[PDB]
């Protein structure tokens, strides 16, 4: 404030200089160091008969500071100080053909020059910095910017000062400057010119109205800061959004709209916003309004800064809040896609504020969403634009840039931006939801010695390097094969004409099975990129510029890392194809009918599959006969119609005998055998009936009976007090496998068919965790739930619609997770049976009691619950805290590599490579046979062998190795390995690694106990230290023929 008062004194000291011509001011600012930042196109001596002038301007304050609603910006804010021009300096024919604009430009040039001289007098020049900029990045409006560096040293305030020179109230006719009106003679409207000049004419009056409403209401400043911070986290500002910039709406516009809503708002002009509201009331009201009330296409809003606001059903195809008191459109800095994306954010925040069960404040206000563009947007392509020169446009750009072109898009920035925007938007259509363009390289500032900003990089002479096109896609309409066009008649319609023209060679005329005659254009999907990518490639290089270069190698590498099944046409088969899953389901349903028509001492009550392939989450897509796949034999819970554990289990096996007998009898095409199952503890009689189907598919059947859980609870009750927790763990495993498994696979199937991309995202996540060897400890369902967390809970983001976006959101969430304090509770449900607040409180009290009896997760680290499981433990138990922290550190280091090295295929390969460090020992093994082809991932099997023992021969034993080895040394050693050799075994899929850490307690020596449970070597006659070399030798003995190398700490 003291500094601004000194500035006002300095200005009142600044002298005035008179009417001069272009040559006079030219010599003036040629022999002065300051160069007039002239607004393009510059004035010319042949078309300049009016003259120039500067007098003492009209000082004032305006902005968030004048509204007293500024905050302590960490990066730094600024205060706008307006200095309008004299109405005597103004003539009534100055609002045509850049006259008043050149007026403002020379006004500001002399102003900054002589304030610089007064600075050279006052000696604040050693710490003060003076420069040019554009009012909210508006090239038609240059402004002065004052900053400082480390007695008016205001640099610690981190503020800045904006010197703007508008025009007085009602100098030129607002109805001659209405957006419809033309004022650049060469006839088309000049909306941007209209906006700039009229806003400069009526800046301060808007501040008067804003302050008046701030005095009429009570929580106005709070609502202002609320909206400002919401928008700031959203990545929104008041700058001109026409230039490949997301903006046009910030604090100033937010406040004007809030005041207009207090001045009306409805279509019936009535007061939707009431001056008695609170902060949250006002903010929720305004967000609900911008979410429910279109302002661009089918309706617009109306008010008067001096009369109630009224909504009308005419949208001017541009965000239009129309002030009649000034004849101005408020949002004139806003692009249509910008308004759309802001309205979508508005609806999202509305639904958040309507969430009654879970709080949403942390996500709404305390999360910056604009940090990683590939998280904020599903699709993003880089396009180098070597456009070149002002004259070289005629040969670089396909389109034209003529007189009306420049009158409309005064800036070639706006021209190119909007051109590529519209061409991509049309040529894509429903394949996407929302579009944005980012002119990579664009700037706003420049020193005083210049006439504008200047750039020479990226094959251009304009402010950018290249263009990054961002898209929020629609998945259900993404992988649609054909680009459908309009119908076909003899007299070619206007729509069909324009369509065929736009599509050139791609256009054609195809007929369909239903009998329709419509134009179209067809593509062929690729298992390495999306058809949207092909389309943007073609349309961009066709209707914009033959010199453009286009790619997204990032998404290329994502789809490359995706596993490719050894299937015909898999090369052209996209990600969103589930044909393999459907074929497996169909074979299984045939088998289903066979067993249901079988006859038995019981009637078959139900046959429910619980296969990961069924729930669309297996690492790979199934391939007939590819039985070396770990996920080949899918589980099928068989349940029969309605007292000792052993007799019960052997009766189960006897029913399997009968089934297998009748099956070998009357379904000889199938093959069958019995496998000992030992995945469940302390049950030594469970037998799974493996069935082999000439669709090359394999299942395992297990009889479920209610007497299982009955006898299990009986044993729980009968066990000793210290023995209890072990049988608790065993019963938990049983429940996870037999009941919650079925419930989970059901609900997950449903929500996946609603969220398509969930299946590929979770498959990629499983791949990544297999590369990181954590799969030996992590159970599939756990990872599935973690990876479904982003879709079912997208706050603040949007639902992912690209494999990259989904993978990165999963990793971001895991990284920022704090399982020690934070729980996880998922509302498994289609988009708009969610949890009651009652169930929510129940799950939360569950979490609180668990974390009370375990405040540091030595027994349970990740806690995740849902309707299927109100316990939050079923897929999280049995995981060591070293594994947990290793996972979280992996996520964090990955997010940091992304933060730093930039997103590239190299960073992705760095993600996929395993750390293999911190491992007390690392055994590198290779299996004698190759297994990539047999596993059926692309680098082919074609029957079942004649011996089932030889099926087993082709199987993979390293899983057995690591599991049983952990069973033995589970008292002393923690191990990890690779589960899927067919993807993580090199070029043959045959290389694995056993990475192990020592338990830090048995690391040392201890008392020689009868139940110490380790291979030790005493250091004395009473104290015993662990026997490392013995351990390694025992590992070598166990894996004698497959251990190839050992590497110690």
């Amino acid at each position: 404030e003291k500094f601004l008062h000194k500035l006002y004194d300095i200005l009142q000291e600044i002298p005035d200089w008179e009417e001069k011509s272009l040559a006079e001011v030219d010599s003036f600012f040629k022999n002065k160091i300051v160069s007039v930042p002239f607004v393009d196109p510059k004035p010319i001596p042949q078309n300049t008969n009016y003259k120039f002038n500067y007098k003492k301007p009209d000082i004032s304050l305006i902005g968030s500071f004048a509204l007293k609603a500024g905050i302590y910006q960490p990066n730094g804010s600024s205060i706008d100080t307006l200095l309008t021009m004299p109405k005597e300096l103004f003539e009534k024919k100055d609002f045509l053909n850049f006259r008043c604009l050149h007026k403002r430009s020379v006004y500001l040039a002399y102003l900054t020059h002589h304030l610089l001289i007064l600075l050279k007098k006052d000696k604040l020049d050693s710490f003060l910095q003076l420069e040019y900029s554009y009012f909210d990045n508006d090239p038609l409006l240059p402004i002065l910017r004052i900053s400082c560096s480390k007695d008016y040293n205001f640099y610690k305030t981190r503020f800045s000062i904006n010197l703007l020179i508008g025009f007085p109230y009602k100098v030129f006719e607002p109805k001659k400057l209405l957006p419809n009106r033309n004022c650049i003679r060469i006839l088309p409207a000049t909306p941007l010119y209209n906006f700039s000049v009229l806003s400069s004419s009526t800046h301060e009056n808007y501040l008067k109205y804003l302050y008046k409403t701030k005095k009429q209401t009570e929580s106005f400043v709070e609502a202002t800061v609320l909206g400002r911070l919401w928008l700031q986290q959203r990545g929104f500002s008041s700058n001109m959004s026409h230039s490949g910039s997301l903006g046009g709406f910030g604090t100033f516009e937010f406040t004007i709209l809030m005041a207009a809503l207090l001045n009306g708002g409805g279509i019936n002009s009535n007061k939707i916003l009431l001056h008695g509201f609170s902060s949250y009331q006002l903010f929720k009201g305004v967000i609900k309004y911008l979410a429910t009330m279109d302002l661009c296409h089918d309706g617009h809003l109306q008010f008067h800064s001096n009369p109630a606001s009224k909504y009308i059903d005419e949208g001017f195809q541009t965000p239009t809040l129309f002030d009649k008191s000034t004849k101005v459109n408020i949002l004139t800095k806003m692009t249509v896609s910008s308004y759309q994306i802001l309205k979508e954010y508005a609806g999202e925040t509305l639904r958040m504020l309507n969430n009654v069960v879970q709080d949403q404040f942390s996500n709404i206000f305390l999360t910056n969403i604009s940090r990683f563009d590939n998280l904020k947007y599903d699709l993003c392509y880089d396009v180098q634009l070597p456009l070149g020169k002002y004259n070289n446009l005629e040969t670089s750009l396909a389109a034209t840039f003529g007189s009306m072109e420049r009158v409309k898009f005064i800036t070639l920035e706006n021209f190119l931006a909007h051109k590529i925007t519209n061409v991509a938007r049309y040529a894509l259509g429903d394949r996407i939801k929302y579009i944005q363009i980012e002119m990579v390289g664009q700037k706003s500032d420049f020193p005083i010695t210049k006439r504008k900003v200047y750039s020479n990089t990226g094959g251009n002479h304009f402010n950018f390097d290249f263009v990054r096109v961002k898209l929020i896609v629609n998945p259900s309409e993404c992988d649609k094969l054909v680009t459908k066009g309009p119908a076909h008649s003899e007299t070619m319609s206007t729509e069909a004409a324009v369509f065929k023209n736009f599509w050139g060679i791609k256009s054609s005329l195809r007929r369909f099975k239903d009998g329709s005659i419509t134009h179209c254009c067809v593509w062929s999907t690729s298992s390495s990129e999306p058809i949207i990518s092909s389309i943007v490639n073609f349309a961009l290089q066709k209707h914009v510029s033959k010199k453009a270069q286009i790619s997204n190698e990032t998404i290329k590498k994502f789809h490359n890392f995706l596993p490719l099944p050894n299937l015909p046409s898999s090369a052209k088969t996209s990600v969103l194809n589930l044909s393999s899953f459907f074929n497996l389901k169909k074979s299984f349903d045939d088998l289903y009918k066979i067993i249901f028509q079988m006859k038995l001492p019981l009637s078959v009550k139900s046959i429910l599959p619980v296969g990961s392939a069924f729930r669309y989450t297996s690492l790979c897509q199934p391939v007939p006969f590819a039985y070396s796949d770990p996920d080949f034999f899918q589980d099928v819970i068989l349940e029969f119609e309605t007292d000792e554990i052993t007799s019960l289990e052997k009766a189960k096996t006897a029913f399997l005998l009968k089934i297998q007998e009748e099956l070998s009898a009357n379904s000889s095409t199938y093959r069958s055998f019995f496998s000992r199952d030992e995945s469940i503890p302390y049950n030594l009689e469970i037998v799974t009936l493996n069935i082999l189907t000439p669709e090359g598919y394999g299942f395992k059947f297990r009889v479920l009976t209610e007497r299982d859980e009955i006898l299990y609870l009986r044993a729980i009750a009968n066990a000793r007090n210290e023995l209890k927790p072990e049988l608790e763990a065993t019963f938990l495993k049983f429940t996870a496998k037999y009941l919650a498994s079925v419930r989970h696979t059901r609900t997950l199937e449903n929500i996946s068919h609603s969220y398509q991309f969930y299946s590929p995202v979770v498959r990629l996540f499983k791949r990544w965790l297999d590369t990181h060897l954590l799969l030996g400890h992590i159970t599939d369902e756990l990872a599935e739930l973690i990876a479904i967390k982003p879709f079912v809970d997208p706050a603040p983001y949007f639902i992912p619609g690209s494999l990259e976006n989904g993978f990165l959101k999963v990793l971001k969430f895991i990284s920022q997770w704090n399982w020690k304090d934070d729980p996880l509770i998922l509302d498994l449900v289609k988009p708009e049976e969610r949890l009651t607040l009652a169930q929510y409180k129940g799950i939360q009290m569950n979490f609180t009691n668990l974390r009370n009896s375990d405040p540091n997760g030595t027994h349970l680290q990740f806690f995740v619950a849902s309707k299927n499981d109100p316990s939050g433990i079923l897929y999280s138990s049995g995981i060591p805290l070293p594994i947990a922290t290793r996972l979280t550190a992996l996520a964090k280091v990955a997010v940091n590599l992304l933060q730093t090295h930039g997103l590239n295929q190299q960073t992705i390969n760095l993600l996929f490579t395993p750390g293999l460090k911190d491992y007390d020992f690392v055994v590198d093994l290779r299996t004698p046979i190759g297994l990539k082809s047999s596993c059926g991932i692309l680098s082919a099997p074609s029957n079942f062998p004649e011996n089932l023992n030889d099926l087993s021969e082709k199987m993979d034993p390293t899983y057995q190795l690591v599991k049983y080895l952990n069973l033995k040394y589970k008292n002393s050693l923690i191990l990890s390995s690779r589960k899927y050799i067919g993807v993580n075994g090199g070029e043959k899929g045959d290389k694995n690694v056993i990475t192990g850490l020592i338990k830090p307690l048995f690391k040392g020596a201890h008392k020689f106990r009868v139940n110490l449970d380790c291979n030790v070597k005493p250091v004395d006659d009473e104290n015993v230290i662990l026997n490392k070399e013995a351990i390694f030798h025992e590992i070598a003995a166990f894996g004698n023929d497959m251990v190839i190398n050992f590497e110690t700490d």
Binding site: L657, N683, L727, E953, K968, H1033, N1040, D1041
Partner: protein, 184 residues
């Protein structure tokens, strides 16, 4: 580490030289053995063993005791070995519930054999003390791809049928008698 031939708690350290594996540029697996005191009739003449190597079976127990007997010209006839649940897959007897880890018992034919092998192992400890290279070499019965594919091998239908048959039979018998007694 050389003079550590026994433990003050009465147990005994047993070294074992481990051979040269190509992936490693020689340890001596330590075991502890102490005579048993249990009132179970089948728990007689037992050497409680602690820290057996991987897959210590009756074969390698016979091999070790034959090493000791051939050295110390002694006679120690092994009878049986008990409680070799080296993986912990029978820690809980769920069956009769609902109706000594890393250690084992080594039974001998008689106290003669057990005391003779006990002398031999005392002198084995003294071998650890004085001459560390006179100590035996422990060869793990090496599990290979063959025994792991054996683990993968499906079960035999005849074994399944016969076992289910006899199990269900005896269970039906015991259940019949139980009902008779209950409602008698």
């Amino acid at each position: 580490i050389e003079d550590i031939s026994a433990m003050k708690n009465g147990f005994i350290v047993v070294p074992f030289k481990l051979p040269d594996h190509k992936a490693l540029p020689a340890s001596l697996h330590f075991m502890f053995a102490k005579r048993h005191q249990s009132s179970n009739s089948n728990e007689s003449d037992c050497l409680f063993l602690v820290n057996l190597p991987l897959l210590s079976n009756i074969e390698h127990m016979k091999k070790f005791v034959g090493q000791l007997c051939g050295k110390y010209d002694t006679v120690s006839h092994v009878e049986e070995l008990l409680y070799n649940d080296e993986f912990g897959l029978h820690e809980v007897d769920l069956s009769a519930l609902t109706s000594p880890r890393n250690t084992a018992l080594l039974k001998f034919v008689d106290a003669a054999s057990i005391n003779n092998c006990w002398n031999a192992l005392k002198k084995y400890s003294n071998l650890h003390a004085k001459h560390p290279n006179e100590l035996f070499e422990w060869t793990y019965t090496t599990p290979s791809f063959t025994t792991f594919v054996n683990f993968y091998k499906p079960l035999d239908i005849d074994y399944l049928k016969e076992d289910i048959h006899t199990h269900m039979a005896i269970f039906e018998q015991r259940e019949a008698q139980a009902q008779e007694d209950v409602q008698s």
